[model samples]
Target chain A: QSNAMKKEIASHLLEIGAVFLQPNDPFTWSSGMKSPIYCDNRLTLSYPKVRQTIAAGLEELIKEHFPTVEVIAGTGIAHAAWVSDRMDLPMCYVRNQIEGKAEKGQKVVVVEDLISTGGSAITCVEALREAGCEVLGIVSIFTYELEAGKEKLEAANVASYSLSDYSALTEVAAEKGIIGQAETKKLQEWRKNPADEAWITA
Target chain B: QSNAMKKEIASHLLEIGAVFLQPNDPFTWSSGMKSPIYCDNRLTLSYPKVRQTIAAGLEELIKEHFPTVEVIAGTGIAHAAWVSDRMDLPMCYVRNQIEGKAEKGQKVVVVEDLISTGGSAITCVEALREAGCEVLGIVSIFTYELEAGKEKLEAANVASYSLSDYSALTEVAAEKGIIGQAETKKLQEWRKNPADEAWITA
Candidate 1:
């Protein structure tokens, strides 16, 4: 069921232009990683049904994976926190430095809009822990699924579930003829160490 | 019905610490305005029931006032745009400078988290307008309701409906013994010209 949801979601993501694959030109991330795909899942917020599916999908995935998530702590992802509000669970947002406060020692599930190097996500987790909140895991809408990002999350012991990812997107893209095998191979190579390669093309 | 909701909402704001009464030691806003009351409605986002009540109230108010709102645009008041998401409407967030987006000539309502000088709100409206969207009005969660902000919105032909304002909040605060009648009157005066140091009788 999750796999099917991932494929359908990737299709919606492509159709809505949230997931952009420009292998020839490539895109640069804030962390200085340059890659072929440039995705902004936050764009889903502008599409009614697409955003709702994301909220519902995240809620279902969290419910299935974790037990008794006391609160939903979000990292400025407008779409993901809506799911917490819809479920009538408390929502805590950790911005820049987590100014005001979140509950002490309460179980929380962090929500990320998009994941790259997981720098921001890890910072939020550390901040939440410092504030005495136990973050069970993270739920991301989309992730590049880079080994670096995955390693970062794993190193911090923060397991994250992303609805659609680079693998899923490329898998579906290949099936839909969005990009050919050559492009897919190049994309995979680029993902290996995005920051190392200055230019990536089909 | 609206009045009751507004009153209830005001009390919750005070109780949850979102609305801080500091007439004796006034809080200075970003624009350097000395305010008798300090509010951070984003703080309310942490409380489940409090945030949900706000989302529902804003939706009800929007549905009753506007003829047909094609899109819901938000400035910094992130939760209200999420309210649009919950109601299954498209939500647009103006994070930086406007950008090349938003539907052309479509009616949209802006959401403001804090209204002091109304600087950010007006900027968002102009950006949305320049982006080819018709900004119908604004839905504010809380406002100082300063004369400056009021005049700015009025001059722009934008009617704003806030769940809690200096008037409503103080009225509720007085009734709930959160503040006194004299302090409420002083709060209103401070709202006139927030930067003026005359009425700030500390």
Candidate 2:
């Protein structure tokens, strides 16, 4: 189901240089995670069509599965307004910590620009729950393939969905000739344990 | 013009409880300015009808006058993304004071939640100009009736428009019987010199 949306999102990301893929030379984040791919989807904010198309995809995905969603929630550090507008749902943003008002018993969806280790995402979920709102699920633009990370969300009873993923991105990359066999293999390995990975793209 | 639009907008503000008009026991702002009117338009973000209406109002205003606007600029502290989405314009938010990228000669419109003292808005303007972007105008949700404050923008060649203003609001208040003439007169006086006013509503 995400294949179409995944390929579409990946292409737009590549077009805008929001994604950096280094098969032979990976990028490292502040968390010391060695990643063969890096994306800062926030850059999409400055691109009209890209931002809209992606927000549309996210909105569509949410509406399809959870058509009756009552509350739309997002971290203020990212682009909640776009998704909020598309769904015509009231948006509440949690920031720095959890810092938005949500009426009790409201069913909510928490959105993120990207999800990796799931620490912040889970933390946000906890904050949202502590505030008396019920979070139905969590959705993001892209997410890495991490079982442990995925487990965290499941542990909290939050359904996790992303428009695209590391696997899908690499598939798109290979399909478009953005990467070849070696880079793909390295990237696959890196995703297994980004923190413990010994391989470098270089 | 903005008369009908302004009046309509003022009513929405009053309806959403966004505007707290305490003419007798006025409130104070961080700048030590006292006023009968105080508004926090950010509260509008949590209401779908209110959010879309304000965005549409901003979009209509921008399209009518500055249709050539290429970039929707925000101080990275507020509402550019909302207006940007309405206009389908690419948004750039400046943080650490104008730290965002802008192509040379790009025509931009700076957005704020509301304008007062003309200070924060002007600061955003200066930051944009320093970055080589030509700002065509500014659009805000509401503004106090500060002729001197408005002058600062005019002197900088900036065309300012508020969807609603103190004048339009007072008119709406009267038309809707939110306040009678006596309370309205005191509000007018507070707007004239909010900082220097020794008057209290009681």
Candidate 3:
């Protein structure tokens, strides 16, 4: 059964306007898929109360998993800086790839605000592993629970979890009337039958 | 006249090991300058309380200095993500130069964690201005309080301030026994006569 914290967290997401829905005008994913809804995890940082709630939830998750994690590694360019600080953890960021003057043996945690296709997440994990980090797991604010993404992560032997997964978030959206039943169905259909064409205009 | 909040902020820096003082073997800055102490403001994110306090301070500064600011712009690569969130403001990052597809009429706030020589700070400002930002002013966590840096900023027509300047930080560090009198004096001397040689061992 979902507890108060889950409801509270979900409500906060809605309050912060993190959830976006437009079934008629589907937003495309990096994987060349099209979908009705979008969750901009970065928006969580915009609201103080929302970010605090997320941080508290994250702290609990960190304690439960990877209890002995030495450092919290931020995966991308900027999000890592903030998440590492919020966790009171030693912070280091993984570059998309090594720049000039490669250094040996750097410890890091792959951090992201959200995980979609898990392509970016895996990129971060590999970069850290190459840099000599054990790479315990990834901690993100949200995750899009696609079977293929999970399979890829398992194949890589990396454990992963999130505060809110796609299923839970979708349920929350429907219950809160943030998205209607018709639109929800469209979203599910789109996810099941993703578009073949690239979504990114650029 | 130092209050509890001020001490708490400084103590949090110490507690999280954010502030480092090593006079015997100095840390080399990106600018090739040497310093006895280094302030990793990014570490503030790990400590929730510390991050909140700093965010509150920044919010207050924004209200006081640039209340009419349209958007809070994060200086590229580091400080943009969190500061933009803390203020609940629309955020964009300033690049060192034009790299990707350029957008028109984008104004930015120029957020930074620290400003020492003001070299990096100027680059960020120029980047924002080039992208059509009005360039309101720069805000940072710390500043070295060098005359040349201040003069350069003034000449550039960019107003700037920090939560604590180098003098205040050094004073607090000495008062809290984080750094001894001699080491602090040495830092002052080094700043006065910045060593030209690189500290990296061959």
Candidate 4:
């Protein structure tokens, strides 16, 4: 059931151009990694139906996994805004650094739009914990499925989940004809072993 | 009816620590202005009931004033996220600066958590217009009610409205025992003819 839901969600993402596949010309991430694909969650908000579906998928995931969560805390800037509203849950943003002592009492859930290296996600968790939130768990729309990212989350003792991951999304993209067989193969190869050279030509 | 709603909204803001009334020790704003009160709309997200009420208030205002709005665009970072979800409207955010042309076809209703001098709000309006959004108008949770802010919005030809202005909010704050009658009077007086030099020492 979960796999099927992920496929459905991935289809929605592809339909809205949230996930882009360009193996011939890899995309460069902020952290300077080269990859054959990129996921821009902000693009999904431009399409109403797709945005609604993404929200619905997120709500279901939250309820299924962290049923006891009292609030949904958005990590980073934009994702926190959307996730908090979709769930109609109280929201708080986690800054990268701890500004001061925690408020006396506050409940929070850390939210991220996408999780790549999980560095930002872990920082959000720590910020929330420092601010006195129970830190229910970190929820994101997608993850790259990098071993380093998974181990980072596990080491922090922070449970993390996403609606879709690289493999699932790539498979759905291929099945839907969003990307050709060759392009899909290139994407899988890049993910399995990301290139060491800088992605930017300049 | 508007007054009553303003009072209810003001009460909620007070409860959540989103608005603070400290006449004895004034708060300095980003623009280097000092005042006896401070309004922080970000706090609304921390309280579930308050956040819901705020979003509902905004939806009501939009439906009444902007019946034909095709999209609801959130300005700044936070409000856009929540308001877009509440209305289920297609969402886009205006950058602080225009980095590129707007999307091909997008209508935007700029959302802000608060408006003071209206500088930030107007910049967003320009960015949205430059980016191709029709820009229905600008909406915020609260505004300072200063002549400069009002005139700025008027000059931009952007219809502006808020859940409560400074006057209405101060009134409600006094009635709810959040601020004393004397403090409220002092604030009103200070607002009318802000003594530039004395502002810091007030």
What would the per-residue lDDT of candidate 1 be over residues A1-202, giving only the tens digit for each residue?
A: 4789888889999999888997767777676767788887767777888777888888887888866888787774475457776677777678756644477888888888888878988998998999888889988888888888889999999989988888889999999988988888888887787776733743
How large an RMSD does model 4 have? 3.5
Considering only chain B, report the TM-score of model 4. Answer: 0.87
lDDT, candidate 4, B1-202, per-residue tens: 3788887887787777888878777777676766787887777766666777777788778877776777777654666656666676777766665421246456567778888877988888888787667777877888777777778989989998888778888888778787776787678766765545453343
Whose TM-score is higher: candidate 1's or candidate 2's?
A: 1
Q: Report clashes for each candidate as comma-separated counts.
A: 1, 5, 7, 3
- By lDDT, the best candidate is 1
Q: Model 4: clashing residue pairs?
A: A73-A109, A74-A80, B102-B131
Q: What does DockQ give for each predicted structure?
A: 0.54, 0.48, 0.22, 0.50
- List per-prediction Cα lDDT, in the order shown: 0.78, 0.78, 0.65, 0.72
Candidate achieving higher lDDT, 1 or 4: 1
Model 1 C-alpha lDDT per residue in residues B13-124, reported as the tens digit of each score: 9889988897767788776767788887767767877777887788877887875988888774457556786567777778655421378898888877777677777888
Better of 1 and 4 by TM-score: 1
lDDT of 3 by residue, B82-198 (tens): 565656565655556543222456445667877877788888788877777677788776666776778789999999967656566566778888777777767676556556323
Clashing residue pairs for model 3 = A73-A109, A85-B45, A85-B46, A86-B45, A86-B46, A88-B46, B73-B109
What are the RMSD figures for all models against the true structure? 2.3, 2.7, 7.2, 3.5
Instruction: Estimate the overall C-alpha local distance difference test score of candidate 3.
Output: 0.65
Candidate 2, DockQ to 2 decimals? Answer: 0.48
Docking quality category of candidate 3 according to DockQ thresholds: incorrect
Model 1, residue A177: distance off in Å is 0.9
Worst ten-residue run, lDDT, model 2 chain A? A93-102
